Write a protein that binds this ligand. Sequence first.
Ligand SMILES: Nc1nc2sc(CNC3CCN(C[C@](O)(Cn4cncn4)c4ccc(F)cc4F)CC3)cc2n(-c2ccc3c(c2)N(c2ccccc2)CCO3)c1=O
Ligand SMILES: [Cl-]
Ligand SMILES: [Cl-]
Ligand SMILES: [Cl-]
Ligand SMILES: [Cl-]
Ligand SMILES: [Cl-]
Length: 211
Amino acid sequence: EEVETFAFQAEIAQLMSLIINTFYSNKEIFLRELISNASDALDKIRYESLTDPSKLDSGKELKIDIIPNPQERTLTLVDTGIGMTKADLINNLGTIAKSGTKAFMEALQAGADISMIGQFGVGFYSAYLVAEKVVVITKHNDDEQYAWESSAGGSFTVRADHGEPIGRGTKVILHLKEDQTEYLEERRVKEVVKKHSQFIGYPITLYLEKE
Ligand SMILES: Nc1nc2sc(CNC3CCN(C[C@](O)(Cn4cncn4)c4ccc(F)cc4F)CC3)cc2n(-c2ccc3c(c2)N(c2ccccc2)CCO3)c1=O
Ligand SMILES: [Cl-]
Ligand SMILES: [Cl-]
Ligand SMILES: [Cl-]
Ligand SMILES: [Cl-]
Ligand SMILES: [Cl-]
């Protein structure tokens, strides 16, 4: 459909540049942060479903799938959580991330570690430790399916997605940088998940490569 391009908030662009440009070997933290976000989104639909059960008509299973695709050089995290509205994508989430971003940057200047990004609520952006491009497909009840995409550089796009319906939730598609293909391997993904994400209350299925 028609693609709309937007500038990130100045503070968010700056955090993204920092994540992309800083020498920082502990890149695997991205996966814990994205799992955390997926888990939060599942909590939200589960909670809402307690006062409006019809919110689960778009899909009853609450789960997280992690899917490596070597041929495409993608690692995808799929959740069946609440999903994001257009307003979330374009404005609202970035608006709330502003204050967390500022505090995190301040902590970094005062000697904090990039692994504390989650404690500031802006862990999503750690995706850029490993991805050159992130595509996000998302569907909230009573809104339509959207595709968001950013290769950083200060901007992102949003468009109506006409791909396969996901029913409800979010797919985070990480287009990995060339030297980060370890996150496509079985043992590596399992090792990182076990390490950092032991106590998440929804089933996480780590899919295997077919070839
Ligand atoms: N798989 C996921 N599914 C879901 S569904 C949902 C809506 N539901 C909302 C999410 C917001 N919640 C509030 C809060 O959690 C509060 N808070 C503030 N400070 C610490 N906590 C929050 C967290 C981060 C933030 F920027 C703004 C916030 F208001 C309440 C329910 C959000 C969401 N995301 C997600 C999570 C964090 C993100 C982003 C996405 N982004 C993002 C990512 C791609 C494109 C555009 C934008 C960039 C900011 O960060 C997931 O990744
Ligand atoms: Cl923004
Ligand atoms: Cl609510
Ligand atoms: Cl909206
Ligand atoms: Cl809903
Ligand atoms: Cl498996």
